[PDB]
Amino acid sequence: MLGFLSARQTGLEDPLRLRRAESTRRVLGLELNKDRDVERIHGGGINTLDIEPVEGRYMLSGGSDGVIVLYDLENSSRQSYYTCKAVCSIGRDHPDVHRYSVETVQWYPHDTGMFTSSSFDKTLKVWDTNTLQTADVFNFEETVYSHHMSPVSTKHCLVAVGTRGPKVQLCDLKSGSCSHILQGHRQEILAVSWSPRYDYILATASADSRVKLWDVRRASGCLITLDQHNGKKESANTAHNGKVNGLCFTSDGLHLLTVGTDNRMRLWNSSNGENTLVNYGKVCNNSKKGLKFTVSCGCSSEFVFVPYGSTIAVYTVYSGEQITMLKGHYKTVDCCVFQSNFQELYSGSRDCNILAWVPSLYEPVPDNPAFEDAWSS
Amino acid sequence: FEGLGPTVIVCPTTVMHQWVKEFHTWWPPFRVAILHETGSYTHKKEKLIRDVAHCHGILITSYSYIRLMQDDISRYDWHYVILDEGHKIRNPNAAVTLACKQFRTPHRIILSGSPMQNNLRELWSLFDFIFPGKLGTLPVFMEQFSVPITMGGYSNASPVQVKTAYKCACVLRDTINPYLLRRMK
């Protein structure tokens, strides 16, 4: 610690070294709400979370009852153990409320004045953050399992939505569109995620055990249908061995992470599509819906936090070793988000509470009355 | 492929002679072959097709020929499909439309001075050729685009219906702009 500081002011080590080292140390020291608490307004289980792309201050949340609650995640008070209050909530009284369970929500990249929520009521809604009303409503024939917006594209505002139908739907915020549709899948599309490196590259995961790398501009099918055993190469080339219900690109976009109900997790090269043969052990996954997970950014070695039953598992992205299990929840956890600036984690589960995982090893120095054994003598 | 690969052009039989002339007065290096009963080999036609595919030349074919041999032409990996008077595939259920759409080439160009003449089904068939995904399947396009616009054209619809026709036309007008270059005189 001190050696990292001294090596910084002296100039032996580049200043990024201490930051990456201290960042990865915070992730390893993650523990429950030592100085935090999330205000509970979700009557049902919480399905999704998203931190704003800029300034990472307000966090959306979508419950199983349809209410969507926008949160505040910094200590406006002097005292510690602050409670993460909710600036606003779109509840039952709202005229434009999701009648049924809202599956995933997302902040629009490049500004915080608009956010999109998609529910099981077969609709994707565009919202105005300031006025808390809608601007565009996109109805769909089948239920909606996921939707993603490109976090890096500046030439378009396409939102990719995967429905229970076997064919991807590409809606454009600019104009209405809602007609561009990608064919090549066979069953329910449980996860869609754009590539942070390439603007027009999209990954779609569906129940036919196939993940396809698409190019939206491309007018002829898919580019790569990822296979498991890297044979010579569709109605074949199964990406997993069951139902692929997860998708998370790495920080730089060079590799793809997928989770299926085969209790297996795989890391895939983004360009060619060959799997990198990182085994990850057994990753428990019985979810029949979209499973949301995240990957750490700005650390020495990237981490991946994937829901694991009633716990969250932390793995090294490339090494594939199990770091620790964050046993905090009582029901199954379905969404986890990562606060890049502060190396904190927020977990939404089905016990109707968002848990905050904050780095430990910083404690007040006294001059603990509860920390003693009471054994008789 | 290196350079321009094998290219197939489908035009009405009254247009093939003009097309072969233009290639000879704007780019001599291109080798252009015309598929016809008269032909230029007085032998089996498969031979000519194979030769063209091999030399990465340009093959000109009548529309009725594409219908006759739909499993033979499409298997030779053509690099460009250019349709002159492209409104000949305006009916999606027509066999000529089915034969024309079987090409697997991402690059497909339609030359039609009057793309739409009757209805938006006419437009969808052409756009399903150049870009199959852009406008979705016909049942979705028929219900979500054509019905709301063809109902709002009558001067008897309620003021909500006419505004719906405008919005549907506006969405349809700007989902086709990058793929339709339409310049009037």
């Binding site: 800029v54 300034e55 505002c157 600019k174 | -």
Partner: peptide, 26 residues
């Protein structure tokens, strides 16, 4: 006294969001 918007990280959800209301208020 505005709470959201601003603090630029293309279309900053004001030019684009007006288009949504310019076509859905019909």
């Amino acid at each position: 006294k505005s709470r959201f918007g601003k603090k630029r990280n293309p279309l900053a959800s004001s030019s684009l969001l007006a288009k949504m209301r310019a076509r859905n208020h019909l």
